[model samples]
Target: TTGLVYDTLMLKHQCTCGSSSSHPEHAGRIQSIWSRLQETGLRGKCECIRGRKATLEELQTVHSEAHTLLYGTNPANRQKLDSKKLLGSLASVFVRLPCGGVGVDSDTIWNEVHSAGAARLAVGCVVELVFKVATGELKNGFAVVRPPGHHAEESTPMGFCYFNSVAVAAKLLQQRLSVSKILIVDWDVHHGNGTQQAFYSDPSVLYMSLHRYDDGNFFPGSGAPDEVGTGPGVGFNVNMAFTGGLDPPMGDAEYLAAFRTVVMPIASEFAPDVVLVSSGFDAVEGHPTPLGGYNLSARCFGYLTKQLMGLAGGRIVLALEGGHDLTAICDASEACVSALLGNELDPLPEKVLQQRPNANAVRSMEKVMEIHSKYWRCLQ
Candidate 1:
């Protein structure tokens, strides 16, 4: 075994747009909590995937040309910023403005670093890693990229994300692997609205999401159960916005049940060539995240991560999406990585998980299954 030749696969990381610590929306320092990831020796584990410039043409695959020109960077449309929703949103996210939320400078290192090329480069890098892993070129890969794309829509970018990186990768997987059935599982605190929008019309790609949304206080505002895809794509987009909060600690228990009832069963039915996780950690119990609500814990992260690994050879890619709390983010991530590596140091927490077994949640979960049952049943 020692004499055999094997190319050592590398773990390429893309740390997108600095951190929310730099943003005025949060009180705690996001980046300064380097201690969270101390066990991994990742002081400099992040880097911008090379060749960051990507074309509006590629972006147009999921974004409109006019829409991109208006919100995104382009010299020809640079002056158009005064009347763009993107600028308005950036102003809102960065610092407190006359608007309901924060208003800070959008033109910062994050913006500068996220060159259209760099953003595309990040997508390409992440997809390449997954592609290699799926094709047996590598065992696994983790892309901690920014401008987290899932929130960016076919025509707009929101929730601190600009491009739908994981979505693009899923599309590419369909084409390259000639695998018609694919599963995209998003465990982020917020729904993958952009990805949902992009694949909403296609039945082949099964997009399932579990996020925290209660009383309409969340951002991006698009993860309702009624959002099941359209026409032929109907039932493909499954969402569970019903599992977290106050006295119930709806975080882990409900989410785990959703995994059992929704994601895993749906994934098994799809029998995808690959699995893509839009890993976000705001829902983890420790601290409030960019997208609020939910009581998910580090062990919950491990539980879900391990569940996904149960698929074929753990054929998966964990792309960083959102997780503002450093401790929770890092621990949640560690849970997944450890699961992938078969290190079970972190198990589900001992606290009593009090998910309100309400009819609404049962209905939410049932709605997802009822919608996708037809397509998923075939594989199952």
Candidate 2:
């Protein structure tokens, strides 16, 4: 059966740094997906897995003590932020008072009140659901919790993320569940810099990401074609970093070509015991340039999920990562969940099949294949 991990508590996290309506990452992201599932009868088709709060120990497996302490639920463990001292003057205080709490960066907002609990639940739900999938308790799973975690690093949180949920689950699978050879596929619009860093030198986990990389000009900026892991993990890291400047943005055809050429071949050869997808829908159409600029249809994500089911005895888990547009993410979430449920996906458009991948996409895939051919026989 397909397991779904979601909790109402996860909706508590909000941007206290400014008007939350203006912030792209908010409670509504997941709420929309959940509502969509209910509306479409997808919720009734899956087993609802109860979500619990993750312990500090579980979080510490991937995050540093300092990182956990700063974002931890315990008040004593958190770093004290003196607003008066940081603001410097009464005028500054008046200006910033409406938006209380610490801002991790310009994009990442941390609320001292509800964020810690919500963040912990996001990590917990993903870990539990993935663990169940790995243990054969469930065929596959989808985590709909939020305060997205891909951008969270070992000791820092950025990009609207508090903890690296997928990274922590991968580490725990290795340590507690005795699972080896994990495959992580990140299809977020931006690179998962934190997740990549966690396994950059470890050969046990193969990290592959397909993201928008306009020559290191993207947000968080790390997934270059040549950033192929260190030491033993030499070719294990694959980055199909699509460049911008195409008259048309990357679409269903471009993404499907990436899988046919780069993602699936390497993943099949790697032969992982479990598959984890940092499923983000910002690449879907309807998003603005700053958030998402691609033209992928929602149903295309379902078709891609169906492709990954060929690996690991159909053991796969998808966790929510990014994507802000309500309709786009909801549609994408429904498509992926329907795929996980083994539903028949609609066939791709004729144009998508007949049309060639844009030159920029072809160049990106060719670079990736050339770089990785030495490692995987499939690529060679």
Candidate 3:
């Protein structure tokens, strides 16, 4: 339970891409997390889990060796920038168009010494921790390292990330532990296009994501409801793209409803031997980015964590994805880690728990059902 925090000495890979300090994703985004852990006294309680750098062979399972070496080597094209410059500027643009292969956010490029090494550590820690938990050495674990990986593709770096950590860890599980089926749930405010794409054509992994989609207008837009996998993976990919077409702000009621109707039903049916969450806290209340407009609370994240706890003898690994607001990440992560410690989640307020989900959310779920009911009996 929140056992053994693992991070690399290289996590401080300061990719000087942002022209200003207002850029949400940066090198020091994780500073507040450790402070919050100490403040909450969680640091003393959980064992420290140190992770090794993932060898090139380990990385090759999820990324090409060429892509691995080439990721952060370009110093000329990626401008030398820092977050301090962004601090004084009021307006900022995070990504710049590149004429080359998939460098989605110019601000994301960093040195291979830190940028790439930190990413590999995140994967290695989760891979080992998951294996330990599966063998009953521990109950559950969470890896708090960053350069979040859910948005990274097999051979492309996008959305402030490179190398799909969860994808690599899942592949390692299949190879090392012989785990049969796996379920990946991503609740970042943005879609996990890379992770979904990685397993979209395979039936062994089920990828589900809930994110704001103003009809393909969001950054890195792709997780539409209709993308329910192909071939043997047909109907295996489940996407709950919450849209802005709804009346107003979506919140705890909406997310909880979707989990009950969509995530819970489908996950129970999938009965994966292990569960992994591409955990992101941007959806939490008070941290709304332009692309994110949800009122999900820290308590709601705990509630969702508890719900997922009912599966796979509670073998779950929540690797951090995207959460910019320092206070928001702290609050939401503490809530989740406390849940991992086996503490019972505080009962959600009746007003929130009993409130019916808005019609817009229900209709979205219905459409997803229409798409996936053909394969999943629970959806039917």
Candidate 4:
């Protein structure tokens, strides 16, 4: 059965730090996804997984003790701490945003009351569902919870993320379940810098990502073809960092080309025990250029999900990362969940298949192939 994890508690994580109506990472993102699943009958087709808060010990597997303690402290008791203690905590954790919000940088808002529980719950749900998939208890799963975790660092929280859910789960799988090889496919429009850092020197986890690089001018700005890996992980890190500014923004054809040429070839050679997708819909159509200028159709994401299903004995877990447009994310979520349920995906339109990827996209993939050729024989 396909496992589904969603919780109303995650809705409590609203961006009260400012005018929430305009906030892209508000609670409505998950609510819309869940509602679409129910409306389309996808919710009834899968086994529901209950949500829980991740323990302090579990979070520490990928985060520092100070990071956990800063977010773990109850907001109600925040004022009770003595001035010295509070000052020390603030100095270590808080990266002040110009507008407002507690301890967060830029647009990543944190509510004093419910953000901690919601963040922990998001991590817990992904971990639980992924564990079940790893054990063969569930064929696969989709985590529809968020406060997206991909951008969260070891001792810092940024980019609307806190715990690095996928990173923590990968670490726990190695320690507790004894699962050796893991494949993390991050298709988020932004780079998963935190997840990359966590396993940069570890050979066991192969971290592959596709994002809009725009000459390192993108938000958080880290993923580059040359940033392969360090030490034992030299070839394990793969970045299909696409350059933007094409006459036409990236679409299904470009993404599918990258998959056919770069992504699948290396992943098949790696032969991982499990597949984890940092599923973000911000790349889907309907957002402004600053957020998601791409023109990918929602159904295209479903087609991509189906491709991954052929790997790791069909053991794949997709966790929500970042997507702001309600209808866009909802549509993408439905397409992905339907794929996990083994439904037949409609064929890509002839136009999408016949059209060649733009020059920029091809160049980006070529750059990646050249850099990775030294490590992956498939690339060679």
TM-score of each: 0.74, 0.93, 0.88, 0.94
What lDDT is reached at residue 131 by model 2? 94
Candidate 1 C-alpha lDDT tens digits along 48-145: 22323345555666776655554346444545644544333433434433333222233222332224444565565566666666776655546655
Q: Residue by residue across 56-142, what tens digits does model 3's lDDT show?
A: 677778786556555532333223332233222212423343422223355455443456557667667777777777777777877
Winner by lDDT:
4
The ten-residue window of minimal lDDT in model 4 covers 78-87
lDDT value for model 3: 0.76
Report how far off residue 34 is in candidate 1 (Å).
7.8
Please state every model's RMSD to the true fold in angstroms.
6.9, 3.8, 6.9, 2.4
lDDT of 4 by residue, 206-271 (tens): 999999988988877999999999999888889889985646799999999999999999999999
Quantify all predictions' global Cα lDDT against the true fold: 0.61, 0.86, 0.76, 0.88
**Model 2 quality (TM-score):** 0.93
Q: Write the number of the candidate with greater TM-score, choosing between 1 and 4.
A: 4
Candidate 2 lDDT tens digits, 1-380:
99998999887787665466657788888888999999999999999998988888999888876567667655544425432232233232122233564566555666677888999999999999999999999999999989888888888788888899999999999999778799999998889999999999999999999998888867877899889999998888888898855467999999999999889988988999999999998999987777767889999999899999999999999999998888889988999999999889977778777888898889888888888887889976
